[PDB]
Ligand binder design. Structure first.
Ligand code: 7W5
Ligand code: 7W5
Lengths: 306, 306
């Protein structure tokens, strides 16, 4: 029993963190096989950040302008190319600690773990979600760029995120590992807004099932609702529409608890409409939307990784 | 910017997780050098758990009753001894992945990271605190025993916890790595209560400074308070007494923000007395006591590990 914001073990990713240095920019990079991936604003200076043409900026660079520490040892860059907003530095040594891995581009609502890094050195690990507005609510300081987001899938490190920048509300924007920004953002230091974010309804519901699975039941009710009626009450409270395809993923949880999905919606309904009136769910005084239905099954069932 | 419940990178500890099997009990163990440490209720059966005399139970065992997987490879046990509630199995192979490490016995209020494990295989990592009642609020299923709690200190894995058991309210009880229970608990399956828990005042305050450091200020006030007066308002709200020695640790944060500690107490005061009235701090609708003053400096300053 218990239910915590839980993050994938970070061992496999740590063994891939390297320092990448160009000019007076030092950020983190991901070394997998003989390629090191970092954000391409490692070739920028400060006056370069307001409006750069990275195509230009990078033809002016040579392999020797890329200092790569892996630990105390220096990696020899032998080639570079730019794929969207990531730099792919071909180095002479392949990484012995390279895990089975993939690059995946995740959908908003899905969670991943973040290994926060400075000068190639992990600082911490935490769990995040990809907000409906393609921001992520992270903990990132200067130098944290090139820290990655990832899931694990038994043995396979599935990379979905690289950190690029912080927006003025303190949320964060980055790219998948093939370099493409999640969301309308660019790696320019020009003003950009997050876009009003919404709550991940299907995840709130799964966390309600995490609650039931753990002994918190005070928020349940005899009432049922139609998905059609429920979405009419979720827009009102800035939740995201729940699809039948959500009902299906929420199914195994539904079946494990004996609480049909559409009643867990009728429960959620009343919760938005009344609040919690002192009470907490799973030690949270808030409806919590950063747990996917797979997260809840993971944590409440005991899936491991190797 | 940002502020998340952040856990130490788990790489170094993962490389120490092994499966330990005796009879039909399988739990996790910590392999460091040529010793594997696990809970001593791996020699128990089910009818053994109600009232065992582990001294007896363990003289009846032989080294060959201890099956230890490290990965796919089997460890040869050559000696065992019982220190309090931990078993120290001397194996023939020393662990190549053994990090610089220590065993430390932490005080209530201090935090540590938990690497949750099943059959030697990490499941997740999360951050915890040692509650004032020597329980910890964890996420632990069957087989999770022998999962450890730890801090890192640049390069040194400082081990402070091994998981042993769950109490009927879904909180967790374990031991330091020299085998001694945190709290009045025993590794018997006899009824035991957690003892009413209190809030870690000094940590709530540090998290308030995390809030200030991150742009949340709505809860501040012109008012000041005396520590003596403040403790008179914290007992009322079941917080723990704040000592001058807390004021000193909260000092660097105090100085970094320009908010004298005793005003952050006057802020806390009003918060307990009024609640938050819709608002949140750092995305939490609750005062959050599982961040130490060192955690906040760690996360808000960018200390790393190697
Ligand atoms: C890379 O290590 C660093 C990580 C930052 C530092 C603190 N937290 C982070 O997320 N990223 C950067 O320094 C970014 C560099 C570029 C990607 C090249 C822009 N810069 C920022 O993240 C930057 N954000 C930003 O400029 O865009 C929003 C904006 C808002 C108002 C006006 C202009 C722009 C700041 C960190 C905010 C400077
Ligand atoms: C070891 O892997 C396992 C981890 C448990 C399983 C689910 N969550 C956990 O924390 N630990 C145990 O199975 C414990 C075995 C002993 C340490 C030998 C007792 N058992 C428990 O944790 C046990 N707790 C308990 O018996 O004490 C409280 C109690 C309350 C009422 C009446 C009697 C005792 C249970 C998990 C609750 C069975």
């Amino acid at each position: 029993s218990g239910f915590r914001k839980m993050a994938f073990p970070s061992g496999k990713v740590e063994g891939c963190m390297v320092q990448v240095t160009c000019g007076t920019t030092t950020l983190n990079g991901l070394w997998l096989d003989d390629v090191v991936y970092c954000p391409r604003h490692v070739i920028c200076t400060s006056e370069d950040m307001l409006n750069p043409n990275y195509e230009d900026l990078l033809i002016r660079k040579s392999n020797h302008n890329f200092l790569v520490q892996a630990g105390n040892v220096q990696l020899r860059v032998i080639g570079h190319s730019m794929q969207n907003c990531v730099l792919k530095l071909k180095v002479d040594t392949a990484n012995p600690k390279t895990p089975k891995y993939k690059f995946v581009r995740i959908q908003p609502g899905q969670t991943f773990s973040v290994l926060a890094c400075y000068n190639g050195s992990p600082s911490g690990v935490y769990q995040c979600a990809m907000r409906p507005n393609f921001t992520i609510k992270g903990s990132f300081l200067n130098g944290s760029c090139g820290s990655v987001g990832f899931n694990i899938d038994y043995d396979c490190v599935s990379f979905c995120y690289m950190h690029h920048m912080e927006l003025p509300t303190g949320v964060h924007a980055g790219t998948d590992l093939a370099g493409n920004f999640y969301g309308p953002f660019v790696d320019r230091q020009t003003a950009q807004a997050a876009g009003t974010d919404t709550t991940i309804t299907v995840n709130v519901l799964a966390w309600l099932y995490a609650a039931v699975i753990n002994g918190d039941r005070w928020f349940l009710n005899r009432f049922t609702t139609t998905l059609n009626d429920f979405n009419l009450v979720a827009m009102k409270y800035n939740y995201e529409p729940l699809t039948q395809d959500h009902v299906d993923i929420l199914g195994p949880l539904s079946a494990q608890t004996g609480i049909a999905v559409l009643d867990m919606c009728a429960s959620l309904k009343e919760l938005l409409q009344n609040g919690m009136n002192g009470r907490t769910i799973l030690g949270s005084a808030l409806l919590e939307d950063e747990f996917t239905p797979f997260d809840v099954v993971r944590q409440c069932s005991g899936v491991t990784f190797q």
